[PDB]
Amino acid sequence: ICIFCCGCCHRSKCGMCCKT
Numbered sequence: 001i002c003i004f005c006c007g008c009c010h011r012s013k014c015g016m017c018c019k020t
Contacts, residue, residue: 002016010017 002018004014005011005017006014
């Protein structure tokens with residue numbers, strides 16, 4: 001599963017990070 005980026009580092013907006 002993509003690393004849900006809940007405003008951790010990138011955009012404040014939470015969203016799964018499907019980056020290899």
